[PDB]
């Protein structure tokens, strides 16, 4: 049994690591995009009006 | 004995807040560790002690 808790907390925690891992990983790259396509669309309107 | 009852109700109540400001503290910083954040507590409780 107390082999036992040595492992389970270990597999659980191993998992929290991945949770951290995703947490480390987070977006600005994404936020960037809407701004750009919103911007490119506008230049296209230029060229078109030109 | 009687008198002794209020004394424990005080020690009760207190180990309970301290268990805990001790719990807003471990495991908050446990996360950190993996990567999360618990903290504007303090600001709560710090201004609370003030």
Swiss-Prot record, chain B:
Residues that the record marks as modified (Phosphothreonine) are 31
UniProt-annotated location(s): Nucleus, Nuclear pore complex; Nucleus membrane
Give a short account of its post-translational modification: O-glycosylated.
| Highest taxon of source | Eukaryota
Q: Which protein family is named in the record?
A: Belongs to the NUP58 family.
Query: Quaternary structure?
Result: Component of the p62 complex, a complex at least composed of NUP62, NUP54, and NUP58. Interacts with NUTF2. Interacts with SRP1-alpha and Importin p97 proteins when they are together, but not with SRP1-alpha protein alone.
Please explain the role this protein plays, according to its UniProt record. Answer: Component of the nuclear pore complex, a complex required for the trafficking across the nuclear membrane.
Q: Give any extra note attached to this record.
A: In rat, the p62 complex contains two different isoforms of NUP58. Isoform p45 has however not been isolated in human so far.
Q: What is known of its domains?
A: Contains FG repeats. FG repeats are interaction sites for karyopherins (importins, exportins) and form probably an affinity gradient, guiding the transport proteins unidirectionally with their cargo through the NPC. FG repeat regions are highly flexible and lack ordered secondary structure. The overall conservation of FG repeats regarding exact sequence, spacing, and repeat unit length is limited.
Name the chain's protein: Nucleoporin p58/p45
Task: Tell me the gene name.
Answer: NUP58
């Amino acid at each position: 049994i107390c082999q036992d808790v040595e492992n389970l907390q270990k597999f659980v925690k191993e998992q929290k690591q991945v949770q951290e891992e995703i947490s480390r990983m987070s977006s600005k790259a994404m936020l960037k995009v809407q701004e750009d396509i919103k911007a490119l669309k506008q230049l296209l309107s230029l060229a078109a009006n030109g | 004995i009687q008198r002794n009852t209020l004394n424990i109700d005080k020690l009760k109540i207190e180990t309970a807040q301290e268990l805990k400001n001790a719990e807003i503290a471990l495991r908050t910083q446990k996360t950190p560790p993996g990567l999360q954040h618990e903290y504007a507590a303090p600001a709560d409780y710090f201004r609370i002690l003030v």
